[PDB]
Design a protein around this ligand. Structure first.
Ligand SMILES: CCN1CCN(c2ccc(N)cc2)CC1
Lengths: 300, 237
């Protein structure tokens, strides 16, 4: 188990760690989060009690270094940093644990939710979407725009998701206009899977990362990418059977975890009704269709 | 954006534009089979592609052989239309290619946009006008060349005959849309109006009769009468 210590908590803030969250009061004796499962990426995220505007956070993998949080009073935010002195870090953590000033990552033993939400998410791929090469962890917030959003304004602070555009020359073979627009299997299998992502695991990893940024930060740009990647699969007549079975599991757990009160802005009625009821794959997503119909029958 | 009554004079400026109407591309007769089921028989159709400033009409005749062995013909017809319009543009010299294509039905927007991806600078636009171009097959010479075609064929017409020698393109388009609205609402009456006087003829190289300026005013008034009438006969007013 790993630990992310906090130097201090000078401003009142709601802190999230993956799907968990807790409230820290201004100048409360909080010195971080312990018992974090090794083997998964994680996200630690923040919403200040005074400016609910800008949710922000950090994706990280404890196997890639020793990370801690320290508030910056000039930039006005909690910042992740790496401690290179390993003995200094072990000493810090052990003292904070001895004084019991840390919250425990509160995982139920039965509970596979976080695994199921991050199965294909890799830190190395996150760092290519979020370019900040000097750090091992990646900052994301509510306002960051995507590369595709900037084509329709600061490039260093963008989410470089893979661009998907159904009315584009990349998506449409000359002479197969109708075929390729109405059946996107060419674009899915040749252009994106074989050509760009290389395999379905990387495709699913970006899809899962986009969903998590949409849910945790309200990133609209992440939401468009998430919906686009679902729609490209559902609108392909020819999809490997293992990919469809895995997509059904992925989406099931995403819909299960979504806050009921955020479906109004996080779910797009069009894509979902098309995917579940009109598309080639309308009969291939049994688990997802069942939870959607029992949890969000209004949208449909 | 969408074309409507507000931006109506834009049709007659000097930016090349084309209307595309697909309503006569896929045409069928519905009939009973020997078993008492219903079946369709396709008949020849046409794409109606019109420059409203010049009157130039690119009439692409759609021969029934293009449907042989195909499924979902109403959907295919939209894509066939877009393929043929795209081929037409590519065949024109750069300085004759349109800067906008206005489709009369919104279902043509995605098929035409996908076929024109090579032409990012040509705007594809819908319209809120309810234009009467479906009635093009009520023009006898247009119907004749469509129904006689034995193979795919493009035929070029000027749907304004020589009117632009005497009137503006705004006025010519208004006359055309009035004539076509009439033919659409009551074809028999409309055609009686246009031919009643045997002394007024249709030149071999024209589509409409050779009316004087004064006779066009009479004609145009008779078409307005017809359209308002039928609008009573229809709504009892
Ligand atoms: C009732 C209004 N709906 C409009 C569509 N919807 C939506 C959700 C996500 C994205 N990326 C785009 C759109 C929000 C809810």
């Amino acid at each position: 188990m790993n630990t992310v210590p906090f130097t201090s908590a000078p401003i009142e803030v709601t802190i999230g760690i993956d799907q968990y969250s807790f409230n820290v009061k201004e100048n409360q004796p909080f010195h971080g989060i312990k018992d974090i499962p090794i083997g998964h990426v994680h996200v630690i995220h923040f919403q200040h009690a005074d400016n609910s505007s800008m949710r922000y956070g950090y994706w990280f993998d404890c196997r890639m270094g020793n990370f801690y949080i320290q508030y910056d009073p000039k930039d006005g935010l909690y910042k992740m940093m790496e401690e290179r002195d390993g003995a200094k870090f072990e000493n810090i953590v052990h003292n904070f644990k001895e004084r019991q000033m840390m919250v425990s990552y509160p995982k139920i033993d039965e509970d596979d939710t976080w695994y199921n939400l991050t199965e294909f998410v890799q830190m190395d791929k996150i760092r290519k979407i979020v370019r900040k090469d000097e750090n091992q962890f990646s900052y994301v917030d509510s306002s960051m725009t995507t590369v595709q959003e900037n084509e329709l304004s600061d490039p260093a602070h963008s989410l470089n998701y893979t661009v998907i555009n159904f009315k584009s020359r990349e998506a449409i073979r000359p002479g197969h206009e109708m075929e390729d627009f109405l059946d996107k299997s060419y674009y899915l299998n040749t252009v994106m899977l074989q050509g760009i992502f290389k395999n379905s695991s990387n495709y699913f990893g970006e899809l899962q990362f986009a969903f998590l940024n949409a849910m945790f930060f309200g990133n609209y740009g992440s939401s468009l990418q998430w919906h686009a990647m679902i729609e490209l699969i559902c609108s392909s007549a020819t999809v490997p059977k293992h990919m469809l079975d895995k997509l059904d599991e992925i989406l099931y757990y995403q819909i299960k975890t979504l806050p009921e009160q955020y479906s109004d802005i996080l779910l797009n009625e069009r894509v979902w009704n098309i995917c579940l009821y009109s598309s080639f794959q309308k009969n291939s997503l049994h688990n997802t269709e069942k939870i959607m119909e029992n949890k969000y029958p209004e949208l449909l | 954006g969408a074309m409507n009554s507000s931006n109506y004079a834009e049709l007659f400026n000097n930016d090349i534009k084309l209307f595309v109407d697909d309503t006569n591309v896929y045409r069928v007769t519905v009939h009973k089979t020997f078993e008492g089921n219903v079946a369709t028989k396709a008949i020849n159709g046409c794409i109606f592609t019109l420059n409203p400033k010049t009157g130039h009409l690119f009439l692409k005749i759609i021969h029934t052989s293009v449907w042989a062995g195909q499924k979902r013909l109403s959907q295919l017809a939209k894509w066939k239309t877009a393929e043929e319009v795209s081929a037409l543009v590519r065949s024109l010299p750069k300085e004759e290619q349109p800067k906008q294509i206005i489709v009369t039905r919104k279902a043509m927007l995605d098929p035409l946009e996908v076929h024109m991806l090579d032409f990012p600078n040509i705007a594809i636009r819908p319209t809120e006008l309810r234009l009467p171009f479906s009635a093009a097959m009520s023009i006898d010479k247009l119907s004749d060349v469509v129904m006689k075609a034995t193979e795919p064929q493009m035929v070029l017409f000027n749907i304004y005959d020589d009117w632009l020698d005497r009137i503006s393109s705004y006025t010519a388009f208004s006359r055309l849309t009035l004539l076509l609205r009439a033919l659409k609402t009551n074809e028999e009456s409309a055609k009686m109006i246009l031919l009643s006087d045997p002394t007024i003829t249709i030149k071999s190289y024209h589509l409409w009769p050779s009316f004087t300026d004064e006779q066009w005013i009479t004609i145009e008034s008779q078409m307005r009468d017809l359209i308002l009438t039928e609008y009573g006969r229809k709504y009892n007013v």
